[PDB]
Design a protein around this ligand. Sequence first.
Ligand SMILES: CCCCCCCCCCCCCC(=O)SCCNC(=O)CCNC(=O)[C@H](O)C(C)(C)COP(=O)(O)OP(=O)(O)OC[C@H]1O[C@@H](n2cnc3c(N)ncnc32)[C@H](O)[C@@H]1OP(=O)(O)O
Ligand SMILES: [Mg+2]
Length: 411
Amino acid sequence: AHAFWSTQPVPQTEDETEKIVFAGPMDEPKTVADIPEEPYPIASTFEWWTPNMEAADDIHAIYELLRDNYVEDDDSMFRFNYSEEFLQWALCPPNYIPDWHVAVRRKADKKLLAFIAGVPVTLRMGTPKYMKVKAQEKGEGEEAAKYDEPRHICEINFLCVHKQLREKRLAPILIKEATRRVNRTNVWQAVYTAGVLLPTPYASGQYFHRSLNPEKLVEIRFSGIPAQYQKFQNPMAMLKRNYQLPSAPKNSGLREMKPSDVPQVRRILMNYLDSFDVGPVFSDAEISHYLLPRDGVVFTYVVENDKKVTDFFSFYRIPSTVIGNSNYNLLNAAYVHYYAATSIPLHQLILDLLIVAHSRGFDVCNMVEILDNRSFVEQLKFGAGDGHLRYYFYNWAYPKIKPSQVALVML
Ligand SMILES: CCCCCCCCCCCCCC(=O)SCCNC(=O)CCNC(=O)[C@H](O)C(C)(C)COP(=O)(O)OP(=O)(O)OC[C@H]1O[C@@H](n2cnc3c(N)ncnc32)[C@H](O)[C@@H]1OP(=O)(O)O
Ligand SMILES: [Mg+2]
């Protein structure tokens, strides 16, 4: 059933997953010296290319590949259109490794055919709380604690094969080469997400959406007018009223984050993320990188009153190409990123996220049911969407956890 995934160090079934009780490696690691120095073999007419994702023309080349060939819905109405600025941001965090950005080009015509990217992440990925209790109940605490310390691993994203090259087994070649480059830096796990089901997730969450411009969403067929609204004389007017938001934020002291806020935002975020079983650890440089505002890309606000930052939220932008509509070309989506609340309830903080995103021209706000995102879904009028975001590890046995135990936002 899986000619590639059955050869890799990942749990193969839910039955196998059910038996895993401690975090730890699937394959005990070899060493860097065991790993082939040369690139994996590839057809003599293709070639490996490492783009420089800080050089505007290489970022452009990868942007076009994704624009035209990255994730689309099944009805081919929308295709992700991650921006050049977003790609530089996402792919070049502190201490990134350029050789983890892996592309394939056609030699003749130098056509870009495929891409995959890895970035460093420091991840807490030790045995989860409910399995540590089960280990205590049986006298197995030290085996359960072995990998408690945060681990320096790879996060994988942006796997893409050109539409003309689909179903030719090029994705396993990209994955094997990326795994070799990561292993040659002495890293032996990765984390990745996908909307598709592969062997075998350690967590799964539904997607949720909050309409900000319902008229546009219905015009482009992202949304429909729900049947309940047909009993009104003006169904669209009532749908707009249902989703209407204030025109300015309600929390006193909300302002954009600035460099001087990095230590306090790091402290409150890390204290909050500690409560989840799987979650990132960020240095001050990584809090700067992932959270300071960047036009068009990431938007972050703090609540500061009386000279103290007590709360913050962030969101990032990913537009989608709208294929074939004579009134709009783009779906402008805001995605809930990290946040922490110490002075106000989460729904009160996140209401200001929706207000700011709507004021800035976003059409919808999206998130998955990770972190404490379930705690504000009803009041803030999120609804579950179709499908599910699955979280995976490469070369890590992990007991299944609920998505409310996941604190890693995947871009
Ligand atoms: C230690 C370091 C480790 C580093 C690596 C860690 C692992 C990272 C893994 C990557 C994490 C990526 C995270 C993201 O970026 S998820 C976003 C993935 N990208 C897209 O959906 C964009 C549009 N689609 C495409 O570009 C292609 O359809 C892709 C590239 C997805 C497959 O190309 P194609 O359709 O031409 O097929 P093939 O003949 O070449 O290959 C067929 C094989 O590929 C397996 N497949 C299909 N979809 C995925 C998928 N999303 N993750 C993993 N595997 C996938 C499939 O089950 C089959 O294997 P098997 O079933 O036969 O066994
Ligand atoms: Mg292929």
